[PDB]
UniProtKB/Swiss-Prot annotation, chains A, B, C, D, E, F:
Gene3D superfamilies: 1.20.1260.10. Residues 53-60 are annotated as: Catalytic site for iron oxidation. Pfam families: Ferritin. InterPro entries: Ferritin, Ferritin-like, Ferritin-like_diiron, Ferritin-like_SF, Ferritin_CS, Ferritin_DPS_dom. It comes from the Eukaryota. PROSITE patterns: FERRITIN_1 (PS00540), FERRITIN_2 (PS00204), FERRITIN_LIKE (PS50905). This is Ferritin light chain. One of its GO terms (biological process) is intracellular iron ion homeostasis. The modification N-acetylserine is found at residue 1.
Amino acid sequence: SSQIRQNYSTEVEAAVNRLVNLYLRASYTYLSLGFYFDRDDVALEGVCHFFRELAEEKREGAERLLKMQNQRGGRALFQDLQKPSQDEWGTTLDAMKAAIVLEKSLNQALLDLHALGSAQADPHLCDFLESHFLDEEVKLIKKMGDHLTNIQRLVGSQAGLGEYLFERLTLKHD
Amino acid sequence: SSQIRQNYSTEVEAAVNRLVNLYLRASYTYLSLGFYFDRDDVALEGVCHFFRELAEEKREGAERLLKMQNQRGGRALFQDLQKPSQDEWGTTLDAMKAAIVLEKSLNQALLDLHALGSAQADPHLCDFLESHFLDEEVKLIKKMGDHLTNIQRLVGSQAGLGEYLFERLTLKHD
Amino acid sequence: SSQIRQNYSTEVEAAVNRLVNLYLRASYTYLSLGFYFDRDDVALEGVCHFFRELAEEKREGAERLLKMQNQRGGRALFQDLQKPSQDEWGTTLDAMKAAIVLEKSLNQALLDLHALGSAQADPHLCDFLESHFLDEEVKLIKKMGDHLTNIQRLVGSQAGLGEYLFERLTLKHD
Amino acid sequence: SSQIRQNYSTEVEAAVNRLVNLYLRASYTYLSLGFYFDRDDVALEGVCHFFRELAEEKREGAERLLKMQNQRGGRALFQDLQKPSQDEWGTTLDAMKAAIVLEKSLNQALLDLHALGSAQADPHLCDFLESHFLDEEVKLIKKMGDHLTNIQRLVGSQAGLGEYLFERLTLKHD
Amino acid sequence: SSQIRQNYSTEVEAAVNRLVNLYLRASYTYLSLGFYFDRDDVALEGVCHFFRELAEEKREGAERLLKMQNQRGGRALFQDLQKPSQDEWGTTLDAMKAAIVLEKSLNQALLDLHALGSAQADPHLCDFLESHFLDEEVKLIKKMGDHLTNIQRLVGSQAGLGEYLFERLTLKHD
Amino acid sequence: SSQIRQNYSTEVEAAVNRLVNLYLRASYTYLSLGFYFDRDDVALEGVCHFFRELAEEKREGAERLLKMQNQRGGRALFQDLQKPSQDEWGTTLDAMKAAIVLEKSLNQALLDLHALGSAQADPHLCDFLESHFLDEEVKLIKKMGDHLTNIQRLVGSQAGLGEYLFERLTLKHD
Ligand SMILES: C=CC1=C(C)c2cc3[nH]c(cc4nc(cc5[nH]c(cc1n2)c(C)c5C=C)C(C)=C4CCC(=O)O)c(CCC(=O)O)c3C
Ligand SMILES: C=CC1=C(C)c2cc3[nH]c(cc4nc(cc5[nH]c(cc1n2)c(C)c5C=C)C(C)=C4CCC(=O)O)c(CCC(=O)O)c3C
Ligand SMILES: C=CC1=C(C)c2cc3[nH]c(cc4nc(cc5[nH]c(cc1n2)c(C)c5C=C)C(C)=C4CCC(=O)O)c(CCC(=O)O)c3C
């Protein structure tokens, strides 16, 4: 019995350790996506950059859960990281559609972990979770939605030009 | 046939893609190691820091291979990342002994990829590899060896004090 | 027998003097290309600029081989410079397609000279060559490939607009 | 019929395109001369420098004619560049004697093109030519003459010492 | 078996330890040469300075081999340093002729050690060697050759004046 | 008879030339010592640094005797430099014990040369010697003695820890 731990349920840490593997594996899809747009036959650098910073952000979410878990008297247990679920990612459109989903998946996770953190009454969890995680997750998921409208409204006329303009003026304007 | 690729063998990229998975999985052991020393019952922060920067360095080596591979006309293929090969890591001594090895393993890899890069005559590979990889690898592997002498010469008297002094004055002196 | 020369084969310099004429004549195509886009009936200034700096870069590669050759005890022998192999260069697309090739041609040259520099064992050559030449050549040949994807994805819808946007936002964004 | 061209005779551009090839080929002799004094058995660096900047100046004259020609509605046509007319260049004296001549040759050209530009009444030509070209050409041809007096007055006593002093104190005094 | 060493052949270090003694003994000739021109009956300070900095440069090459050798798991073994092979060094001409040779001798050494470093397949050696050693060695050996042309072209008229001018204006002009 | 020399005995210079070889060979032991503590199985960097600066200091003493000797009308004659008298140097304790001695040996030399410089009446010698040499020699020999007390008082309990603390806090405190 680690002289620190208090109010930390064993399921609350089992959930934190799956969260850790979720962030690490979403971080994996993001670099998988990134180098796919650096490819010389896709050549869409604005997009690589979008995804390479996302990958970082996710590794950050991971490191932060690891740190809070050690701070509560948890035992960070690691599992292996499932490889990305597709290799060629298509259009920006399609890449972006895979993305907004990986993000409903992780927000959903936060949502379920936050709940177990309350029905199994857990005060500073039902705050550590929302302040960094729940919140950024909503901002990120709106801005991902706005991107889709935009690339859809563009890439639906003559599509190749839509992709270009979008990466040239969206990641170089706002 | 990607209009870019020239002098890049298919085995040279298969090797680069295993190198990518080697760097990613060594990056995995390093964060596994790091959070283990942030544990409140190990409490050796100097060591967490050592390993958390190493983990980064390795993710860097990875990103750099991914980037050169896309630059040669390669197809970065990803595999899943094997989980760390141990969970509790012991003493700094033992953690450090696991480390100098993960590093002979990756240097050995560089060594074999560099060789296939020449017996299958490959000019800017038999330079991209040494300038970042081969070289840092030697500096890193000496400094890891010097650490062992030091922690061995300390942690062999009354061991607990050796661990402390070493993390307090080595990661806070040189 | 020039009191300097050491380990420098006569074929290694014959190759360096063809390399010199290759760089000088690729430098020639680049200015030929450049003034063609300054033409008032092509009017695509972003492109002239692309090619006028390339022409310089190549004259640089040339001067540098001349200098290393005098540094090894070689006798720089000059030949005349073959005029560009086409006069009107078309579309940016077509101009760009002529380009990525002049560049596989010179990289191939570096590749063959580097090899003769080793099968005829030649240590500081099998380094002078890669550090400036082999390496820049790969970076240049990727970025030329990325350009093609981009102008192809644009100039394939209504083509005239593709050309315009590409020169306006690519050479004025990244 | 290019919607720009006005008062530009076809012979005025044929002359401008030979002028272009004259500047390019004089630029060729100058680098041929330059690397000859970087040779370790001539070793006269002050002189290499003299000629390497001259070579640039000439490439400049060339680029400028190309640019004015595109500005008048001309079609810049390129020809190949005749290799330098000698390989070993001797003494500074002799190198310098080859030089003052390549310069009467190009000034003579300016002189004949300027004339056709008037007997075939051509107003902004019979100014573009003198402002950059005719004028610099006189200053350059005096200073080349002054150099000859000087190296002749020196290199006529015990000659080797004359060469040395001249390159040491002339290109390092005025 | 030193826990560090990897891919380092025993002959590769035996060669590195002779290299160490070569650099140390060339460093010895250079100070032997230096104080000979500080002599009040030679009095040629520009030359002492030339050689005293060369001596340093060589001690540097030595220290650097010692450091890389300890970095590979080698055992730096020292031998005694053979005294300079002449005591009075003559003219600058003669001093300089002894020099360009001590330098073909060490470049030749680099050349042979680099080769054993490859026929006995050794990746980060066949780079540590060229980046500092092989390369500087060529630049140094050209500039030494240029000096000879110069002092020969001077010291061949009335010789005493040639020596003076050369040390006064070469080591005080470029 | 060198027109400079005055009051300089031939034995005074024979002594200065042995002094030169003493400084050069003590400079040799110091680098021999230095790289021994850079070894990855000794790993005591504070000590390498101690000895590498000592080695320099000694080369300085040497260069200074060479310079005064040329200043008096002496003929600096060189001899070869005897290799260090031991290869593995042990403990800091033992390394340090070899050191304080190489220093009584050179101070003793200064002492005997200073004496011959007076019984063979020699005014500016019986000052050049004490101002740089005799004096620094006493300061150096006290501080070497203080080090011994300290490492002895430490390395006599559990010895490995004594070595560590001493190099960590002595070369990083005062
Ligand atoms: C293969 C799946 C993974 C992906 C795609 C991934 C992606 C990243 N990991 C990063 C940083 C990092 N990743 C890190 C440990 C790991 N990262 C790992 C796996 C992944 N990490 C593994 C395995 C690790 C252990 C679990 C660490 C420690 C950092 C650096 C943190 C720091 O200190 O800056 C960055 C930041 C790059 C930059 O320069 O902006 C990315 C994009
Ligand atoms: C072989 C005959 C040639 C010689 C000797 C020559 C010499 C030169 N060309 C230069 C620059 C240049 N030369 C250039 C295009 C060419 N240059 C070429 C042929 C020659 N160019 C060819 C062939 C080209 C096309 C006609 C360009 C574009 C520049 C650079 C202009 C700029 O943008 O700075 C420079 C400037 C070097 C410096 O660093 O100061 C020299 C000396
Ligand atoms: C093998 C025995 C020797 C040892 C161990 C030695 C050690 C040294 N010699 C140095 C500098 C130097 N050593 C020098 C000439 C010699 N040095 C030589 C032999 C030795 N020199 C020989 C042989 C030389 C001629 C007698 C010179 C000229 C310098 C540099 C002086 C300057 O101009 O800075 C330095 C300074 C290193 C630094 O970066 O702080 C050390 C440690």
